Design an enzyme around this catalytic site. Structure first.
Site, PDB file in Angstrom:
ATOM      1  N   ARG B  25       4.851  -4.305  -4.495  1.00 21.57           N
ATOM      2  CA  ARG B  25       4.675  -5.691  -4.086  1.00 21.57           C
ATOM      3  C   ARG B  25       5.345  -6.728  -5.013  1.00 21.57           C
ATOM      4  O   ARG B  25       5.869  -7.748  -4.549  1.00 21.57           O
ATOM      5  CB  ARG B  25       3.185  -5.976  -4.152  1.00 21.57           C
ATOM      6  CG  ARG B  25       2.702  -6.927  -3.138  1.00 21.57           C
ATOM      7  CD  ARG B  25       1.183  -6.992  -3.230  1.00 21.57           C
ATOM      8  NE  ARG B  25       0.816  -7.398  -4.565  1.00 21.57           N
ATOM      9  CZ  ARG B  25       0.768  -8.664  -4.983  1.00 21.57           C
ATOM     10  NH1 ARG B  25       1.032  -9.688  -4.160  1.00 21.57           N
ATOM     11  NH2 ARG B  25       0.432  -8.892  -6.234  1.00 21.57           N
ATOM     12  N   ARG B 138     -19.745  13.144  12.556  1.00 25.18           N
ATOM     13  CA  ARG B 138     -18.358  13.013  12.026  1.00 25.18           C
ATOM     14  C   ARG B 138     -17.924  11.573  11.815  1.00 25.18           C
ATOM     15  O   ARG B 138     -16.708  11.309  11.769  1.00 25.18           O
ATOM     16  CB  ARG B 138     -17.414  13.669  13.048  1.00 25.18           C
ATOM     17  CG  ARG B 138     -17.764  15.093  13.272  1.00 25.18           C
ATOM     18  CD  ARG B 138     -17.424  15.491  14.695  1.00 25.18           C
ATOM     19  NE  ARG B 138     -17.485  16.931  14.863  1.00 25.18           N
ATOM     20  CZ  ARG B 138     -16.906  17.585  15.865  1.00 25.18           C
ATOM     21  NH1 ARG B 138     -16.228  16.935  16.799  1.00 25.18           N
ATOM     22  NH2 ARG B 138     -17.003  18.908  15.925  1.00 25.18           N
ATOM     23  N   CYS B 158      -7.956  -1.728   5.932  1.00 22.95           N
ATOM     24  CA  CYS B 158      -8.627  -1.287   4.713  1.00 22.95           C
ATOM     25  C   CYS B 158      -7.632  -0.826   3.649  1.00 22.95           C
ATOM     26  O   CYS B 158      -6.529  -0.421   3.958  1.00 22.95           O
ATOM     27  CB  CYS B 158      -9.641  -0.141   4.994  1.00 22.95           C
ATOM     28  SG  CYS B 158      -8.895   1.467   5.575  1.00 22.95           S
ATOM     29  N   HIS B 159      -8.046  -0.913   2.387  1.00 20.71           N
ATOM     30  CA  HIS B 159      -7.336  -0.332   1.287  1.00 20.71           C
ATOM     31  C   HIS B 159      -7.691   1.175   1.168  1.00 20.71           C
ATOM     32  O   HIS B 159      -6.849   2.040   0.807  1.00 20.71           O
ATOM     33  CB  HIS B 159      -7.696  -1.078  -0.051  1.00 20.71           C
ATOM     34  CG  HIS B 159      -7.481  -0.230  -1.264  1.00 20.71           C
ATOM     35  ND1 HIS B 159      -6.221   0.036  -1.785  1.00 20.71           N
ATOM     36  CD2 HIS B 159      -8.361   0.487  -2.013  1.00 20.71           C
ATOM     37  CE1 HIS B 159      -6.341   0.876  -2.802  1.00 20.71           C
ATOM     38  NE2 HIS B 159      -7.633   1.169  -2.958  1.00 20.71           N
ATOM     39  N   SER B 179      -2.563   3.766  -0.989  1.00 21.59           N
ATOM     40  CA  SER B 179      -1.601   3.915  -2.107  1.00 21.59           C
ATOM     41  C   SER B 179      -2.393   4.311  -3.330  1.00 21.59           C
ATOM     42  O   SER B 179      -3.539   3.931  -3.435  1.00 21.59           O
ATOM     43  CB  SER B 179      -0.828   2.600  -2.410  1.00 21.59           C
ATOM     44  OG  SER B 179      -1.720   1.514  -2.661  1.00 21.59           O
ATOM     45  N   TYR B 221       4.346   4.472 -11.762  1.00 21.55           N
ATOM     46  CA  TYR B 221       5.115   3.363 -12.340  1.00 21.55           C
ATOM     47  C   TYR B 221       6.104   3.874 -13.369  1.00 21.55           C
ATOM     48  O   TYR B 221       5.804   4.796 -14.125  1.00 21.55           O
ATOM     49  CB  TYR B 221       4.199   2.276 -12.907  1.00 21.55           C
ATOM     50  CG  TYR B 221       3.686   1.435 -11.767  1.00 21.55           C
ATOM     51  CD1 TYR B 221       2.439   1.662 -11.244  1.00 21.55           C
ATOM     52  CD2 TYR B 221       4.514   0.447 -11.160  1.00 21.55           C
ATOM     53  CE1 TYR B 221       1.954   0.920 -10.175  1.00 21.55           C
ATOM     54  CE2 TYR B 221       4.052  -0.308 -10.110  1.00 21.55           C
ATOM     55  CZ  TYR B 221       2.753  -0.050  -9.618  1.00 21.55           C
ATOM     56  OH  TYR B 221       2.258  -0.759  -8.565  1.00 21.55           O
TER      57      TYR B 221
END
Lengths: 273, 273
Positions: B25, B138, B158-159, B179, B221
């Site tokens: 980002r 479920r 959502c994250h 991520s 990173y």
């Protein structure tokens, strides 16, 4: 490399050996394993499984009906707890379910013939617009719900989420499903989301990358066990290829005639209950 | 068996060798692989990684602050684009974010001192109530959002999503994150969701099973590369155990004093930017 279908076959063998007995919603028995994942390359091949013949026509037709955002069941060719409504049931009006969530997410419904342009979130056009405006985005996510859960005030959780990913001019897709019927649903859904990825890649000028399929409750219905044992003795043949027959501009412009499977050479159909 | 931390280490090695350059980002560089998964047993051990010392106190404190549904930053001890608000910023009022979504999902906010009992969906009490009413379900799913995305009219994705699973008196958890920062965030989040699972299992009379961690964009990173190469030469030591020190009834009743890590014997801290 190893044929991608070996992953599917290996997961089937693992549930048979290590799955635990667990009942589904209707109190039907399964063998179940929680948490699985498989990666199928979409590069220069298409993962239409070859150890049994998969109903490719059904895959393609149903995906187009979803992309249309249709709530008219008749439009499809010609788990019965999804119930509500007298004359509406008769007409084949399914209420605000399936591709109505992909294209008109959260839009108040009327009837299946109503014209919903610009009502609700268009999750699918959103994903395509993001791929174009910011291919690096980690939020390129669309969700889908089981119609059964759709009181929807209830903030019900999704049945499945697709996250897309772009690097080096290639589009990848990860499907997370909360449960996966390994014998019937899973081969169908691999084709369906790999197709969706092919379609999205086509319109955004990208090449298909990987399809990653992740499950929560990965299960085998008890009566699928003997057919699956047989299927496991079959040797995968090279995956076929999928060909898009003309240049297509918008996701809504695809029709079944634009797609051609080539070199598909599967083992025979297996009938599973 | 192989030590569970070998999965983490193996994923680190795979991103180093096969990850592709991709920007985040802020336009900072990463090596990235899309789609990964690892399974850590929670049975009779606790996956607090040992190849560097993990900040266990921070893990535990932050999780309790989330469970409290707190929007007061001061309550924590004493990616700056999450901006909005003049004197509200000053007070440490973070707006309707983090555990406010776990406990008061979709509730209209007021201020951090406001009393929100019964406002919005309590996703966490919902999950616990379902484990009790239908362990086979479920749909035992809770979601969490990045505060940055939370216009929330926008129907933002959502994250992260956690799905729980129950079989044979054992509770399992699968976290799907869109991520995962492999160097900094991932070791922290393994401890955090394994802890959450331990807490939920305790109150629902179940034994912890597995924690499965699934990622979309799994990345390293660029400046974490040299420290991670060093960390990879270290040999995992046996995972420690987590002990809950008294019988606890409700999820809101846990406090930091109820938990004890035993036999934690890690390699030294690694500082990563």
């Amino acid at each position: 490399p190893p044929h991608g279908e070996l992953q599917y076959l290996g997961q089937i063998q693992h549930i048979l050996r290590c799955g635990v007995r667990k009942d589904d919603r209707t109190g039907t028995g399964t063998l179940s394993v929680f948490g699985m994942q498989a990666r199928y390359s979409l590069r220069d091949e298409f993962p239409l499984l070859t150890t049994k013949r998969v109903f490719w026509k059904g895959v393609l037709e149903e995906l187009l009906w979803f992309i249309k955002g249709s709530t008219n069941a008749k439009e499809l060719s010609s788990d019965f707890l999804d119930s509500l409504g007298f004359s509406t049931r008769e007409e084949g009006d399914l209420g605000p379910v399936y591709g109505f969530q992909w294209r008109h997410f959260g839009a108040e419904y009327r009837d299946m013939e109503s014209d919903y342009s610009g009502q609700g979130v268009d999750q699918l056009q959103r994903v395509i617009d993001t791929i174009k405006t910011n291919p690096d985005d980690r939020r390129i996510i669309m969700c889908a719900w089981n119609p059964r859960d759709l009181p929807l005030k209830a903030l019900p959780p999704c049945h499945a989420l697709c996250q897309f990913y772009v690097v080096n001019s290639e589009l990848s897709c990860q499907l997370y499903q909360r449960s996966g019927d390994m014998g019937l649903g899973v081969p169908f859904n691999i084709a369906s989301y790999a197709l969706l990825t092919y379609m999205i890649a086509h319109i955004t000028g990208l090449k298909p990358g990987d399809f990653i399929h992740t499950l929560g409750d990965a299960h085998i219905y008890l009566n699928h066990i003997e057919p699956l044992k047989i299927q496991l003795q079959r040797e995968p043949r090279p995956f076929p290829k999928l060909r898009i027959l003309r240049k297509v501009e918008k996701i809504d412009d695809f029709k079944a005639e634009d797609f051609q499977i080539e070199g598909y050479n599967p083992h025979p159909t297996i009938k599973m209950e």
